[model samples]
Target: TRDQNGTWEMESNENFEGYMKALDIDFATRKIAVRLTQTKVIDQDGDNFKDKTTSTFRNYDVDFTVGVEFDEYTKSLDNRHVKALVTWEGDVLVCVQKGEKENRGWKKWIEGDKLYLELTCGDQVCRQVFKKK
Candidate 1:
């Protein structure tokens, strides 16, 4: 699988500010987050995975198995806690965050050499593209 185990670097992001706003992220944190270049290091074995997202400003790490629910803290990003569940929709990876926010989740998939991520919160959606590093 394309997302199995690899390092990917951010190439571009769209409407990230809007996504942050929907989540009620503070102005200062959103400012820094929108400007940082994020890299994802994913170590996956079958249904289990360790996904780490890093930037010059902050790093977020998560270890989870597909179909299992876990408590997730946004930490440096939004400082919110939620129940998160990851699943596979065909070849795409999808995570649903159940908490105070409505329609909050993310989807990840690969197209050609690019890894595409779509983050959702309410009616806001942020699109990010990454390239394998």
Candidate 2:
């Protein structure tokens, strides 16, 4: 159950630019973001966990647990929000973020293998995948 620790590096990604655009990232920000892939560093303890998806241009750190809800603020990745929940659906971990896109908020589940992240936006969903490091 604790096997998803360690690190996951981006081997390939899709729709990154489009996703950034969907988030209304500035052109300069998107330019840098497109060039820098994220390496996810995860530290898991039972259901508790912390992760920092880092790149040369930016980094986003989040801490939460399965089935537990907490306040989450996206510092630079996008707008700030509140209420985040991560849960386990089957063997996959799903996360949901609540914000006001009008602004509203965003999950996915992965075991100890490939990290498949599915991001949700209004009328848009962007999926990203990463491999073990």
Candidate 3:
């Protein structure tokens, strides 16, 4: 089904460097970030959620309620402050991030045995797929 409550290991990361570049990330960090082993652990309780991204280099964690706008700091990534709002469109979880960067947001969904995450920044888009563990 569309269960997103388990640990997932990244199976593929596509054009991640381009997405990082659109965020003005440094060259050195982008290189390392693209190579790091990444995992996702998510816990969803009704309209509240905890989303975590774990990697060999760094991690990102956030908790938010669906349909609520909240201030978020991209600490381990860009270290920028943004107002984020997450909601569900059908079975997909969509986040609209209001920040300095244009068209910055993400979409997540589950299809078959894979969990798909799409990250967007400016004109760059990165797609990552993971398998549940």
Q: Where does candidate 1 have its weakest 10-residue lDDT segment?
A: 54-63
- Each model's C-alpha lDDT? 0.88, 0.74, 0.89
lDDT of 1 by residue, 1-133 (tens): 3555988888777898899999999999887877666889998987899999987654568888999999998865676899999999999999999989999999999989999999999999999999999
lDDT of 3: 0.89
- How would you encode candidate 3's per-residue C-alpha lDDT over 1-133 as one tens digit per residue? 6568888888877899899999999988886887676899998877778899988854557999999998998865776899999999999999999999999999999999899999999999999999999
Residue pairs with clashing backbones, model 2 = 92-109, 93-108, 93-109, 95-107, 97-106, 100-103, 101-104
* Predicted structure 2: clash tally: 7
The TM-scores, one per candidate, come to 0.58, 0.51, 0.57
Ranking the candidates on lDDT from highest down gives 3, 1, 2
Candidate 3 clashing pairs? none
TM-score of 1: 0.58
Q: TM-score-based ranking, best first?
A: 1, 3, 2
Residue-wise C-alpha lDDT for candidate 2, range 1-133, written one tens digit per residue:
5478898988876889899898879988776777677899998888888999988644567888777898887755664676887777777777777766532333555667878877777778788888888
Which scores higher on lDDT, 1 or 3?
3
